[PDB]
Amino acid sequence: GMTEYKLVVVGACGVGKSALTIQLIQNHFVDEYDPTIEDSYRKQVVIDGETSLLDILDTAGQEEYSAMRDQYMRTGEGFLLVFAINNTKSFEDIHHYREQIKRVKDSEDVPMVLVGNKSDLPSRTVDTKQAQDLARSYGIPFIETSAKTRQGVDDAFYTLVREIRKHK
Ligand SMILES: */C=C\C(=O)N1CC(N2CCN(C(=O)CNc3cc(C4(C)CC4)c(Cl)cc3O)CC2)C1
Ligand SMILES: Nc1nc2c(ncn2[C@@H]2O[C@H](COP(=O)(O)OP(=O)(O)O)[C@@H](O)[C@H]2O)c(=O)[nH]1
Ligand SMILES: [Mg+2]
């Protein structure tokens, strides 16, 4: 059929995973989205002239790391590592998410993008420099987003597709 990318949105509770997903899919900001609901949504896009379908998995719920769940996560082709720029713990968590993804994929070369969300807030506690430097050490792109204003949303997901398209 037509080209498909499975993109998995990860990161701590409350960082804006669901809001980023729904902004990408239907261009509206959701204020309240149940943190236990993990759903996927598919969107037709055109990225660098190539039509494709993005299958976006908005991860949620309990943090349980089992063989079956690992194998399910392994079906993701690229991962958005999302933290919130006003939540230092969510940034500290990022390496844990990354290491679990590498483990399940049996690869140190998995397509990923680091996303600092909630850029519209007055309350930053994570410096852009620190997140850029982390992403550089990982060899992956860094995007800042606001699911509220939509700034950076398409850049984050389309950058992740472009990372997948490099992947050997
Ligand atoms: C407040 C709820 C919420 O938004 N979230 C909890 C946090 N994660 C949800 C998804 N999750 C798991 O399902 C644990 N299993 C698991 C996850 C991964 C990832 C790191 C998500 C890719 C992998 Cl690779 C394997 C397995 O088994 C973690 C916590 C978001
Ligand atoms: N100001 C602001 N609030 C946001 C943004 N993204 C998410 N939120 C709010 O942050 C809370 C958590 O968002 P949610 O999408 O549920 O995060 P998730 O737990 O990672 O799925 C909600 O009240 C959202 O409306 C953002 O970019 N800016
Ligand atoms: Mg959610």
Domains of the chain: 1-168 (3.40.50.300)
Q: Candidates 146, 149, 153, 155: which one to mutate for ligand 2, based on the most atoms within 8 Å of Cβ? A: 146
Contacts of residue 106, defined as CB under 8 A and 6 or more positions apart, other chains included, come to none
Q: How was this structure determined?
A: X-ray
> How far apart, in Å, are the Cα atoms of 85 and each of 82, 108, 125, 129, 146?
10, 26, 6, 12, 10
User: For residues 115 and 108, what is the distance between their CA atoms, to the nearest angstrom?
Assistant: 19
Annotated resolution, angstroms: 1.4
Nearest CA to ligand 1 atom 25: 70
Q: Are 47 and 163 in contact (CB under 8 A)?
A: no
User: For residues 33 and 130, what is the distance between their CA atoms, to the nearest angstrom?
Assistant: 29
